[PDB]
Design a protein around this ligand. Structure first.
Ligand SMILES: CC(=O)N[C@H]1[C@H]([C@H](O)[C@H](O)CO)O[C@H](P(=O)(O)O)C[C@@H]1O
Ligand SMILES: [K+]
Length: 381
């Protein structure tokens, strides 16, 4: 496919609202100022769908944001863009939908793309600051789906708000960021992050929600330690294993009882160092013969700060516990205003295998085809 391309250009995109009016951002010429938090999902048709926060006015988290979607049917050479999910537009300074997590799955025979984003309107502080209510009244977690290969998206009426309210100890919940997965048994699984109510000692926890149809969701009874909460889950034999953001070394836990109890997973626990503050990272599995190998992307953060330099691809040997840097695909110092995030996507359509990444590059979202690295990754078992 193309080796590298720009999916969304900082200060170079113009979006229209649901009425057809142009959204005037703070970028030059009234363009969208900054893009963050990329999520990518590839379909059985080879279609690449990329989601990202379109932070129209500033890179700040508490700002005016819509979820943009870019679709490529030519291997990432050209992109068709639009807004997939619009914020409520209650507050022109703060209304937002943010931090996408997507899943491409076959739900009862229908290939579907799901995108889940957190939604806020009047909260002006970071989401972790709201722990008085269960749940926070300004918050919501919305799910949209596409059943036509990423062309149109529509809201799914879900029971997610209900399960959170019923739990009673969760102030807000968000996807783990990047991509979720469909288990071997067909269940849809979104890794999640959660801010607990003020009474709970642990402020953050990680877990997941699962569903068979994408409409009715469930939360398991247990909780995994929170750390930097952003996380991805992979299926390994009869276990679900997560890979969590943490200031310093990443953490990885395993559940053998479907979310009831979690224990450290040695093969990936404390293997990659993201240094100061930590960063979101993407972790997926790639089959090789009858075995599995985990591919992972996150920043080396050579400056030990918010610049999160050197977004790299790592291979994790799930059997021996060995880790190897495969490719430092973005060996640059990022913009401290918001940098370092990424999302990997592997797919084998018939006999064609592709490994793609999407990542933050100074306010823009870039795409790279990393398929040439597959033989090396696949040998790590
Ligand atoms: C919902 C939300 O706030 N998401 C933001 C999170 C969040 O604030 C932290 O994880 C603390 O919870 O921070 C990151 P970053 O600043 O590390 O790049 C950007 C995300 O868009
Ligand atoms: K933040």
């Amino acid at each position: 496919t193309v080796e590298k391309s720009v999916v969304f250009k900082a200060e170079g995109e113009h979006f229209t609202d649901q009425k057809g009016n142009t959204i005037v951002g703070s970028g030059s010429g009234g363009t969208t100022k900054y893009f963050r938090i990329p999520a990518m999902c590839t379909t059985s048709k080879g279609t690449i769908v990329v989601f990202a926060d379109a932070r129209h006015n500033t890179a700040s988290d508490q700002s005016f944001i819509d979820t943009a979607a870019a679709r490529s049917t030519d291997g990432g050479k050209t992109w068709n863009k639009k807004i997939a999910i619009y914020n409520d537009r209650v507050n022109s300074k703060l209304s937002r939908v943010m931090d996408p997590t997507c899943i491409v799955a076959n739900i009862q025979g229908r290939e579907t793309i799901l995108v889940m984003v957190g939604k806020w309107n009047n909260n002006d502080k970071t989401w972790g600051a709201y722990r008085d209510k269960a749940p926070d009244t300004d918050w919501d977690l919305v799910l949209y789906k596409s059943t036509d290969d990423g062309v149109t998206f529509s809201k799914v009426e879900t029971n997610i708000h209900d399960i959170v309210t019923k739990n009673g100890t969760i102030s807000a919940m968000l996807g783990g960021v990047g991509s979720g997965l469909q288990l071997n048994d067909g269940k849809l699984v979104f890794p999640v992050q959660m801010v607990r109510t003020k009474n709970i000692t642990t402020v953050l926890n990680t877990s997941f929600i699962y569903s068979t149809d994408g409409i009715t969701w469930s939360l398991p009874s247990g909780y995994c330690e929170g750390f930097g909460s952003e996380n991805n889950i992979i299926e390994f034999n009869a276990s679900l294993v997560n890979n969590i953001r943490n200031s310093g070394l990443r953490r990885s836990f395993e559940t053998k009882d479907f979310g009831k109890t979690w224990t450290e997973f040695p093969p990936m626990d404390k293997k990659v160092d993201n240094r100061n503050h930590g960063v979101q990272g993407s972790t997926i599995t790639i089959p090789s013969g009858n075995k599995l190998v985990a591919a992972h992307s996150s920043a080396q953060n050579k400056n030990n700060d918010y610049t999160r330099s050197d977004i790299s691809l790592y291979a994790h040997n799930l059997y021996s516990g060995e880790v190897k840097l495969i490719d430092d695909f973005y060996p640059k110092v990022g913009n401290a205003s918001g940098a370092g995030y990424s999302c990997l996507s592997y797919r084998k359509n018939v006999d064609k295998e592709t490994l793609y990444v999407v990542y933050e590059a100074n306010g823009s979202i870039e795409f790279q085809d990393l398929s040439r690295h597959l033989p090396v990754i696949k040998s790590y078992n």
